[PDB]
Amino acid sequence: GSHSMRYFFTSVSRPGRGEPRFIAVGYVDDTQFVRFDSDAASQRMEPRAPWIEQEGPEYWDGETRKVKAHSQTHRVDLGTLRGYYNQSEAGSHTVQRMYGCDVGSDWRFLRGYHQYAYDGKDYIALKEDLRSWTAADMAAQTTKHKWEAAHVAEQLRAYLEGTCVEWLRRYLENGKETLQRTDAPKTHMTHHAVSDHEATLRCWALSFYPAEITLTWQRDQDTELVETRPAGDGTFQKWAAVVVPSGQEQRYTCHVQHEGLPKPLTLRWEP
Amino acid sequence: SLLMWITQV
């Protein structure tokens, strides 16, 4: 079906402790495959999946060099952004960058992304046309005019429509049995009393990939829903709960939608 | 594979 490749970069300043922290992670869909950490021993882009390890030394030297170049840009950006907002040297600040590309069922380019944040807020982002910038405040409009002048959008659009899609297709063919799988959720319901007059019905989804999933209740209000969470073995988990008057649990149903399921499931508990 | 051409803010 539809696929994607994303890179996530986190850059954090450390006042009076020298070098800033730089962390970079690469995903294909919901599977992490590479990482870099400035605090790690290696100072190399490291593998985080079996299928990526078959890439030769040339790939690893290239990505390492590229990620070290990202960190240098980011190191400067922290100082530049400090100037724009007129902030002190003694405070820690965070920069984040996400970029990547989507592909459809036919593995052709669908969409591309390049977003940039400062202290957890939108700073500047590339629009869906890939020729144009949304600036979030006056400081980012300075960056907008600078990036328009240096033809940044054009250079990004070349990467996003070309290199990004070619390497995504390559990774999808190398890690075929990992990335092109679809594990359906294994589901069950638990019941617990909370009162003489009330009772909790919890609905579980376990061992599913990818993470996109919908759990909803139906009757024929007080609904709890946890954030989808990693099992730690590649698959994901989620539960949804409702507090229901006891003696009326039979009229409530849990509904599960997921691409691994050929049709969506309906779960019912009865006393 | 990562981006190559990066421009400062």
Epitope: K68, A69, Q72, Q155 | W5
Partner: T-cell receptor
Framework: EVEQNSGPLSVPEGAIASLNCTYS??????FFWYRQYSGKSPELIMF????GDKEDGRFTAQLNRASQYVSLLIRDSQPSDSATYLC???????????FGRGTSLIVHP | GVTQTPKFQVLKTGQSMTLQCAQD?????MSWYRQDPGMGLRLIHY???????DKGEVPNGYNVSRSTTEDFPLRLLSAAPSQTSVYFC????????????FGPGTRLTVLE
């Protein structure tokens, strides 16, 4: 990779100086002209990335991707344009620009 | 701009020396070229940022380090007569269209 005739090239004051530079890699993205006076450092004149002409005062960079060359034309050449002109090319698979050996230009007054 | 010291230097064969190169423009990329009469600019070492250095066309006999954004010193370990040359430091941003900015240069003569 990036080829340039060494010269010297002689041009009379007032005439057009025509400097050429070929390249082998079609994946080349941006193209640069630096000027180096004798005993001084190379200094940028201009860059070009899109096919066609680009004018900047008396200088005109010309890029032709089909025939794989970059040119620098200098209209109304003066004796102070006498220098070595260095061509450099940046490409897709590296951060290192590839330099030609440079062409020496003398403009006789 | 890009500064480098010293501008001229005489060494005897076997001596060590460090050519300084500093830039105040927050360039990520920094390089060291040598220029000799017949052979144009040849790359010695480069660095795309702090904590990484890489070999160029003619790295042998030279060392570099990049522990900061600004500085990119070139060490000559054991000076040889064939290292007699003009040495240029060159730095730039990482845009496609970023051009090198060259330092004033360092004329080195190594004698027996």
């Amino acid at each position: 990779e990036v080829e340039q005739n060494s010269g010297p090239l002689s041009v009379p004051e007032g005439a057009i100086a025509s400097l050429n530079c070929t390249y082998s890699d079609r994946g080349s993205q941006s193209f640069f002209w630096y000027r180096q006076y004798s005993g001084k450092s190379p200094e940028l004149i201009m860059f070009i990335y899109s096919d066609g002409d680009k004018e900047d005062g008396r200088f005109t960079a010309q890029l032709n991707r089909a025939s794989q060359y970059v040119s620098l034309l200098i209209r109304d050449s003066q004796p102070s344009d006498s220098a070595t002109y260095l061509c450099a090319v940046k490409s897709g698979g590296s951060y290192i620009p590839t330099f030609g050996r440079g062409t020496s230009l003398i403009v006789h007054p | 701009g890009v500064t480098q010291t010293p501008k001229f230097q005489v060494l005897k064969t076997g001596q060590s020396m460090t050519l300084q190169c500093a830039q105040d423009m927050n360039h990520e990329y920094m390089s060291w070229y040598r220029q000799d009469p017949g052979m144009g600019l040849r790359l010695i070492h480069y660095s795309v940022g702090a904590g990484i250095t890489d070999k160029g066309e003619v790295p042998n006999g030279y060392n570099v380090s990049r522990s900061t954004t600004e500085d990119f010193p070139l060490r000559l370990l054991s000076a040889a007569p064939s290292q007699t040359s003009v040495y240029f430091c060159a730095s730039s941003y990482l845009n496609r269209d970023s051009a090198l900015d060259f330092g004033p240069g360092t004329r080195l003569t190594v004698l027996e």
